């Protein structure tokens, strides 16, 4: 019949998922663990390359109208509104929206304003797609639900963000999340999974630096009878003291050059000699684990989650970028455009709704495209329209 018989259980699916995580990556802490990651030169690089193509796609965007004359007028007004935000551009919005690859979540608030003077005087633009940083949100409950765990009523922002050195209704907010189903409000950050590998990768690099510094192979060792050493310590103005002070400086400067040599007395008291000079070496076998290949495995382990693992040497990286683009477009096409047209009472059928199409992330091949037009053109399957002509 026409009646729900269950709940999405948003408030339970979360509370199981916070337990099943290591405690350094639960909500109020993940905000710090993200920014204490990134400073790894493989983690920054993966995120930077992802944002490189996201910005490119949302630069040369287009609005595709319908067939009727009404849709064409609506498409022009949509393009004006999206290209005339006061102090904002879609590239800035795209690079703010794509932050859910770091925190599983992204919050944008829609603000509308009236036009004073212009082509569309009397209508409503969008002033700013105000980004709400994840760090300024509520650390206790960020997202508030019904009396039951069925739906979401709004998002809470901390009171400490209104200071220099509150609950926003859900209808005003555009939510984007990734890595989880529709029942996970706090999405799974792609850095979850990487975390254990990042912890190991760091530790190994630390061992390499201290290990290389402490490999005192070939160090110089000198043996002197203790009679001379003891006499110098108690008689600072004795000939033994002068020679000991000379050794402490001469041995420090003992390099290899044009005049390097050693001259020692050859006296002998027992099976061992009184004076000797030998260069030390590891009496046995050295290290075995070859920490170099340990790090390489963990680096490929981290970059694979971001689709940027090819730097260790249609593709995987290009397909990964398309995922982020589609998530943003769904919010833009289905949450802002229908509401924006409602304010200016432009009510159209479903088939006449214009939509925004993102740009292409891979450049067109001049060699391939030019010879593709000929093959289609030489048969006559290519229409004669200004759309085809303008493509050159």
């Amino acid at each position: 019949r026409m009646s729900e018989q269950g709940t999405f259980a948003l408030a339970k699916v979360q509370v199981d998922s916070e337990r099943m995580k290591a405690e350094e990556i639960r909500w109020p802490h993940l905000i710090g663990t993200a920014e204490s990651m990134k400073q790894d030169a493989t983690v920054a690089t993966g995120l930077d390359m992802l944002y490189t193509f996201v910005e490119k796609a949302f630069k040369d965007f287009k609005v595709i109208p319908g067939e009727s004359e009404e849709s064409k007028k609506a498409a022009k007004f949509i393009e004006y509104c999206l290209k005339n935000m006061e102090g904002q551009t879609l590239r800035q919005f795209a690079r703010d929206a794509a932050t859910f690859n770091e925190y599983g979540l992204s919050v944008v608030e829609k603000v509308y304003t009236q036009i004073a003077v212009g082509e569309y005087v009397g209508k409503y633009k969008v002033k700013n797609l105000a980004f709400r940083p994840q760090a300024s949100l509520s650390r206790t409950n960020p997202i508030v639900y019904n009396s039951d765990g069925s739906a979401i009523v709004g998002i809470k922002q901390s009171l400490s963000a209104f200071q220099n050195y509150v609950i926003i209704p859900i209808s005003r907010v555009m939510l984007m999340n990734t890595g989880g189903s529709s029942s996970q409000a706090l999405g799974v950050s792609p850095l979850v999974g990487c975390y254990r590998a990042w912890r190991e990768k760091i530790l190994i690099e630390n061992l390499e630096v201290v290990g290389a510094t402490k490999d005192m192979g070939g160090v110089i060792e000198l043996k002197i009878p203790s009679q001379i050493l003891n006499k110098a310590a108690m008689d600072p103005s004795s000939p033994e003291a002068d020679m000991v002070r000379g050794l402490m400086s001469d041995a420090a400067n003992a390099h290899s050059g044009e005049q390097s040599f050693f001259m020692l007395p050859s006296d002998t008291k027992d099976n061992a000699p009184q004076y000797s000079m030998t260069l030390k070496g590891i009496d046995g076998m050295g290290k075995q684990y070859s920490t170099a290949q340990l790090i390489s495995d963990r680096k490929k382990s981290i970059l694979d989650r971001l689709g940027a693992g090819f730097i260790n040497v249609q593709t995987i990286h290009t397909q990964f970028v398309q995922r982020v683009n589609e998530i943003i477009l769904e919010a833009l096409n289905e949450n802002l455009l229908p509401q924006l047209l409602a304010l200016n009472d432009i009510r159209l059928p479903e088939t006449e709704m214009p939509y925004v199409k993102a740009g292409e992330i891979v450049d067109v091949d001049m060699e391939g495209f030019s010879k593709a037009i000929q093959r289609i053109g030489a048969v006559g399957y290519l229409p004669k329209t200004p759309k085809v002509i303008n493509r050159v």
Binding site: S36, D40, W198, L203, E205, L207, V210
Partner: protein, 46 residues
């Protein structure tokens, strides 16, 4: 003549006593050049 041979790491009682000692310094504390928050400063697990 009761404790001649000692083998470490084969008892839970001996493992946690060393692990939970606040003065203990183990291999997982290698800070390297300068300290980073990616490396623990205490031996005991959270």
């Amino acid at each position: 003549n009761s404790s001649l041979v000692i083998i470490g790491g084969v008892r839970k009682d001996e493992f946690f006593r060393v692990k939970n000692n606040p003065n203990s310094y183990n291999g997982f504390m290698e800070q390297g050049v300068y300290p980073t928050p990616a490396i623990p400063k205490q031996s005991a697990w959270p």
